[PDB]
Enzyme design. Structure first.
Site, PDB file in Angstrom:
ATOM      1  N   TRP A  41       0.809  -1.223   0.000  1.00 55.52           N
ATOM      2  CA  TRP A  41       0.000   0.000   0.000  1.00 55.52           C
ATOM      3  C   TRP A  41       0.841   1.272   0.000  1.00 55.52           C
ATOM      4  O   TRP A  41       0.481   2.246  -0.668  1.00 55.52           O
ATOM      5  CB  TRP A  41      -0.929   0.044   1.208  1.00 55.52           C
ATOM      6  CG  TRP A  41      -2.176  -0.769   1.087  1.00 55.52           C
ATOM      7  CD1 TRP A  41      -2.494  -1.876   1.808  1.00 55.52           C
ATOM      8  CD2 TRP A  41      -3.288  -0.510   0.228  1.00 55.52           C
ATOM      9  NE1 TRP A  41      -3.748  -2.327   1.458  1.00 55.52           N
ATOM     10  CE2 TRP A  41      -4.249  -1.510   0.477  1.00 55.52           C
ATOM     11  CE3 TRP A  41      -3.566   0.471  -0.735  1.00 55.52           C
ATOM     12  CZ2 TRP A  41      -5.460  -1.565  -0.195  1.00 55.52           C
ATOM     13  CZ3 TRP A  41      -4.774   0.424  -1.399  1.00 55.52           C
ATOM     14  CH2 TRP A  41      -5.706  -0.594  -1.134  1.00 55.52           C
ATOM     15  N   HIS A  84       1.559  -3.211  11.037  1.00 59.87           N
ATOM     16  CA  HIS A  84       1.101  -4.159  10.037  1.00 59.87           C
ATOM     17  C   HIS A  84       0.515  -5.396  10.687  1.00 59.87           C
ATOM     18  O   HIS A  84      -0.612  -5.808  10.368  1.00 59.87           O
ATOM     19  CB  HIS A  84       2.227  -4.575   9.113  1.00 59.87           C
ATOM     20  CG  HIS A  84       1.746  -5.470   8.030  1.00 59.87           C
ATOM     21  ND1 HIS A  84       1.223  -4.972   6.869  1.00 59.87           N
ATOM     22  CD2 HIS A  84       1.586  -6.812   7.987  1.00 59.87           C
ATOM     23  CE1 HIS A  84       0.805  -5.976   6.121  1.00 59.87           C
ATOM     24  NE2 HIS A  84       1.020  -7.107   6.773  1.00 59.87           N
ATOM     25  N   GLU A 112       2.829 -16.557   9.311  1.00 56.49           N
ATOM     26  CA  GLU A 112       2.778 -15.380   8.457  1.00 56.49           C
ATOM     27  C   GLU A 112       4.196 -14.937   8.083  1.00 56.49           C
ATOM     28  O   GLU A 112       5.124 -14.996   8.896  1.00 56.49           O
ATOM     29  CB  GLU A 112       2.030 -14.267   9.208  1.00 56.49           C
ATOM     30  CG  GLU A 112       1.820 -12.987   8.423  1.00 56.49           C
ATOM     31  CD  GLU A 112       0.861 -12.000   9.090  1.00 56.49           C
ATOM     32  OE1 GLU A 112       0.628 -10.939   8.479  1.00 56.49           O
ATOM     33  OE2 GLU A 112       0.351 -12.274  10.203  1.00 56.49           O
TER      34      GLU A 112
HETATM   35  N1  9XR Z   1      -3.476 -12.036   2.637  1.00 61.52           N
HETATM   36  C1  9XR Z   1      -3.161 -13.197   3.214  1.00 61.52           C
HETATM   37  O1  9XR Z   1      -3.354 -14.270   2.637  1.00 61.52           O
HETATM   38  C2  9XR Z   1      -2.597 -13.197   4.594  1.00 61.52           C
HETATM   39  C3  9XR Z   1      -1.705 -14.218   4.900  1.00 61.52           C
HETATM   40  C4  9XR Z   1      -1.164 -14.296   6.158  1.00 61.52           C
HETATM   41  C5  9XR Z   1      -1.490 -13.360   7.122  1.00 61.52           C
HETATM   42  C6  9XR Z   1      -2.349 -12.293   6.833  1.00 61.52           C
HETATM   43  N2  9XR Z   1      -2.568 -11.364   7.803  1.00 61.52           N
HETATM   44  C7  9XR Z   1      -3.106 -10.051   7.466  1.00 61.52           C
HETATM   45  O2  9XR Z   1      -4.521 -10.054   7.494  1.00 61.52           O
HETATM   46  C8  9XR Z   1      -4.963  -8.716   7.466  1.00 61.52           C
HETATM   47  C9  9XR Z   1      -5.461  -8.429   6.080  1.00 61.52           C
HETATM   48  O3  9XR Z   1      -4.399  -8.754   5.224  1.00 61.52           O
HETATM   49  P1  9XR Z   1      -4.408  -8.552   3.641  1.00 61.52           P
HETATM   50  O4  9XR Z   1      -5.629  -9.146   2.982  1.00 61.52           O
HETATM   51  O5  9XR Z   1      -3.079  -9.024   3.195  1.00 61.52           O
HETATM   52  O6  9XR Z   1      -4.499  -6.954   3.577  1.00 61.52           O
HETATM   53  P2  9XR Z   1      -4.313  -6.001   2.308  1.00 61.52           P
HETATM   54  O7  9XR Z   1      -4.807  -4.630   2.699  1.00 61.52           O
HETATM   55  O8  9XR Z   1      -2.941  -6.155   1.819  1.00 61.52           O
HETATM   56  O9  9XR Z   1      -5.269  -6.584   1.178  1.00 61.52           O
HETATM   57  C10 9XR Z   1      -6.665  -6.543   1.309  1.00 61.52           C
HETATM   58  C11 9XR Z   1      -7.245  -6.149  -0.044  1.00 61.52           C
HETATM   59  O10 9XR Z   1      -6.819  -4.827  -0.398  1.00 61.52           O
HETATM   60  C12 9XR Z   1      -6.632  -4.764  -1.824  1.00 61.52           C
HETATM   61  N3  9XR Z   1      -5.231  -4.325  -1.994  1.00 61.52           N
HETATM   62  C13 9XR Z   1      -4.172  -4.691  -1.241  1.00 61.52           C
HETATM   63  N4  9XR Z   1      -3.064  -4.019  -1.607  1.00 61.52           N
HETATM   64  C14 9XR Z   1      -3.442  -3.191  -2.592  1.00 61.52           C
HETATM   65  C15 9XR Z   1      -2.766  -2.189  -3.396  1.00 61.52           C
HETATM   66  N5  9XR Z   1      -1.465  -1.941  -3.246  1.00 61.52           N
HETATM   67  N6  9XR Z   1      -3.490  -1.518  -4.301  1.00 61.52           N
HETATM   68  C16 9XR Z   1      -4.805  -1.735  -4.481  1.00 61.52           C
HETATM   69  N7  9XR Z   1      -5.500  -2.625  -3.772  1.00 61.52           N
HETATM   70  C17 9XR Z   1      -4.869  -3.357  -2.827  1.00 61.52           C
HETATM   71  C18 9XR Z   1      -7.022  -6.101  -2.385  1.00 61.52           C
HETATM   72  O11 9XR Z   1      -8.395  -5.965  -2.690  1.00 61.52           O
HETATM   73  C19 9XR Z   1      -6.790  -7.012  -1.209  1.00 61.52           C
HETATM   74  O12 9XR Z   1      -7.473  -8.269  -1.345  1.00 61.52           O
HETATM   75  C20 9XR Z   1      -3.731  -7.872   7.823  1.00 61.52           C
HETATM   76  O13 9XR Z   1      -4.085  -6.851   8.762  1.00 61.52           O
HETATM   77  C21 9XR Z   1      -2.738  -8.884   8.374  1.00 61.52           C
HETATM   78  O14 9XR Z   1      -3.001  -9.160   9.759  1.00 61.52           O
HETATM   79  C22 9XR Z   1      -2.899 -12.229   5.550  1.00 61.52           C
END
Ligand code: 9XR
Length: 180
Positions: free
Chosen positions: A25, A34, A128
């Site tokens: 982000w 984070h 993680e």
């Molecule tokens: N994602 C996983 O599989 C995962 C694996 C192991 C541990 C975790 N633990 C995380 O869960 C929570 C949510 O993680 P994420 O889903 O990775 O959070 P993001 O904000 O990176 O992504 C959520 C959504 O946000 C969107 N997105 C993410 N990054 C971008 C970006 N750079 N630009 C546009 N859209 C973006 C996209 O729709 C995505 O699915 C975090 O607070 C942390 O505790 C997550």
């Protein structure tokens, strides 16, 4: 050894991810913000980290939870129930850092005691791994797509390989992340 393979649930499709990789982000390099859920999408949306798991199951639980939210929404008359989610399979390298070791390094140096000491292995971000700033497209091997039809309840799963993936011998960094 540290894992060579990690997994990431994301809503975005491979036409984006397989070409562009994942980009964090923003420039918020604070590991604690984070890991505790403050700097990702539902928070300040500026983290410099991209979460992954060494446990595929962890990402499947995440996908299942998000699909169930869509189902509950349809029942409440707040959506059609359709859902598309993706699980990416990723090669880790030295820009990927264990969350548990990074967490402990941070809180031991800068924290108070809250969750520093009474923090077992299963409890403390067990599987993680944080990619710093980017997961390049060359690290992204394949994706599983899960589509749920909100009207009939049918769920369909498909798989796609990334032509841009580079097979190299790498694993996650053995050391905690430290800023600077
Ligand atoms: N994602 C996983 O599989 C995962 C694996 C192991 C541990 C975790 N633990 C995380 O869960 C929570 C949510 O993680 P994420 O889903 O990775 O959070 P993001 O904000 O990176 O992504 C959520 C959504 O946000 C969107 N997105 C993410 N990054 C971008 C970006 N750079 N630009 C546009 N859209 C973006 C996209 O729709 C995505 O699915 C975090 O607070 C942390 O505790 C997550």
């Amino acid at each position: 050894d540290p894992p060579a393979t990690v997994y990431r649930y994301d809503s975005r499709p491979p036409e984006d991810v397989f070409q562009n990789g994942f980009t964090a982000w923003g420039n918020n390099d604070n590991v604690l913000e984070h890991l505790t859920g403050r700097s990702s999408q539902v928070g300040s949306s500026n983290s410099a980290f991209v979460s992954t798991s060494s446990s595929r199951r962890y990402t499947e639980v995440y996908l299942e939870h998000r699909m169930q939210e869509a189902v509950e929404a349809e029942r409440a008359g707040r959506g059609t129930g359709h859902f598309i989610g993706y699980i990416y399979e990723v090669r880790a390298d030295n820009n990927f850092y264990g969350a548990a070791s990074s967490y402990f390094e941070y809180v031991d140096t800068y924290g108070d005691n809250a969750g520093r000491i009474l923090a077992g292995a299963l409890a403390t971000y067990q599987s993680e791994y944080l990619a710093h700033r980017r997961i390049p497209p060359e690290n992204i091997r394949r994706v599983t797509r899960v589509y749920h039809n909100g009207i009939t309840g049918e769920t369909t799963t498909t798989e796609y390989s990334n032509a841009r993936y580079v097979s190299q011998q790498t694993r996650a960094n053995p050391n905690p992340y430290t800023s600077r």
